[PDB]
Amino acid sequence: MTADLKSLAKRIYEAYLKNFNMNKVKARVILSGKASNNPPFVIHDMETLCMAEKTLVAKLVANGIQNKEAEVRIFHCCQCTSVETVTELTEFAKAIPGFANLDLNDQVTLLKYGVYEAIFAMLSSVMNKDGMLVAYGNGFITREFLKSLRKPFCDIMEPKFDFAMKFNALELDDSDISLFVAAIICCGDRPGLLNVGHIEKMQEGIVHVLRLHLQSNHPDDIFLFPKLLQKMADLRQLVTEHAQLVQIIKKTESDAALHPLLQEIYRDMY
Ligand SMILES: CC(C)(Oc1ccc(C(=O)c2ccc(Cl)cc2)cc1)C(=O)O
Ligand SMILES: CC(C)(Oc1ccc(C(=O)c2ccc(Cl)cc2)cc1)C(=O)O
Numbered sequence: 001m002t003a004d005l006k007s008l009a010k011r012i013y014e015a016y017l018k019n020f021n022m023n024k025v026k027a028r029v030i031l032s033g034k035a036s037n038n039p040p041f042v043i044h045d046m047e048t049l050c051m052a053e054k055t056l057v058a059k060l061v062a063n064g065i066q067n068k069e070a071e072v073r074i075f076h077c078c079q080c081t082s083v084e085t086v087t088e089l090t091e092f093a094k095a096i097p098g099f100a101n102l103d104l105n106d107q108v109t110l111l112k113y114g115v116y117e118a119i120f121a122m123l124s125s126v127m128n129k130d131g132m133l134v135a136y137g138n139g140f141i142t143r144e145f146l147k148s149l150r151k152p153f154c155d156i157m158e159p160k161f162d163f164a165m166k167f168n169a170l171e172l173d174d175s176d177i178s179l180f181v182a183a184i185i186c187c188g189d190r191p192g193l194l195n196v197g198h199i200e201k202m203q204e205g206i207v208h209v210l211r212l213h214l215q216s217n218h219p220d221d222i223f224l225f226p227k228l229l230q231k232m233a234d235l236r237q238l239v240t241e242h243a244q245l246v247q248i249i250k251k252t253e254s255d256a257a258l259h260p261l262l263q264e265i266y267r268d269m270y
Contacts, residue, residue: 001212008097008205009179009213015095016178019088021136023174024125030137031128040133040140045148046070052139063257071153072256074141079259081134085122086115086265089185096182098202106199109192112265114185116242117235121181124164132157152249156242163238167231170224176217179210180228184235243270 017023029035043049049070053060056077060066065076090111093099099107126133131142146157172180186203188196211225218224246266249256258266 001216005209008209012182013175013178015092019092027125042140044142044145071149083261085119089115093185103194106194109190113190116239117184118181124167127164182206183210240270
């Protein structure tokens with residue numbers, strides 16, 4: 001692990017810390033309850049949802065969502081969070097060496113297919129087996145409450161929890177996750193790329209730094225890099241299924257609206 005490779009890892013780590021409001025260190029501090037006796041407000045049923053939404057009234061009233069079905073309200077708010085994360089991933093990508101120099105349409109394409117893989121990767125940091133932190137760690141929506149919603153909404157998040165439990169068992173830290181997210185974005189085989197050669201060059205550099213970083217930071221998890229290559233493949237499959245579910249909601253749910261700022265990402269994705 002050469003000094004230049006360590007420096008690239010720390011600079012990507014820095015960009016990740018400066019661009020994402022929530023990181024795994026903060027998440028685990030809250031989920032563990034060590035730094036405080038004031039835990040997040042728990043949304044575990046329809047009544048505690050409605051209580052939480054008293055705080056979120058202005059968010060709901062903004063788009064006239066407040067009289068919608070609870071399932072629609074919940075995932076309106078979740079969409080708003082995705083849009084926020086997409087904005088942060090877009091700034092973060094500037095710190096990947098070479099990304100900003102790519103053809104603008106290639107940057108758009110890399111983000112189009114990459115953001116949700118990174119989103120579900122990073123979501124793992126705010127999940128445990130019982131639920132997920134929401135609202136910058138201030139609330140906690142239980143896994144069972146999400147499974148209790150009417151179909152198809154009860155099937156949206158459960159496969160993300162299933163992915164996260166195995167991902168979290170890898171015990172990645174934020175230095176690892178920042179390079180993983182960088183590697184997710186630099187995939188050379190997204191549909192519609194223009195300069196595949198330039199991108200593969202950029203990808204090989206990030207994947208090389210990632211492998212050596214993992215070997216240095218988790219010396220006792222010898223095949224951690226191969227394990228994370230498989231997670232990258234699992235995430236691409238997870239996102240493909242998510243897109244198909246989004247498509248089914250679009251076709252079968254009349255009163256649910258796809259956030260303007262996510263319509264373009266999903267348009268013709270898979
Ligand atoms: C500033 C504030 C409160 O920031 C939020 C950040 C994240 C979320 C969520 O992701 C969320 C999703 C579903 C529920 Cl049920 C509750 C919360 C909501 C609000 C807002 O924008 O009003
Ligand atoms: C992770 C998340 C929030 O997952 C979704 C979950 C539910 C919906 C919807 O409720 C919906 C509403 C209208 C349409 Cl047309 C399609 C879907 C959208 C995305 C995302 O992808 O950011």
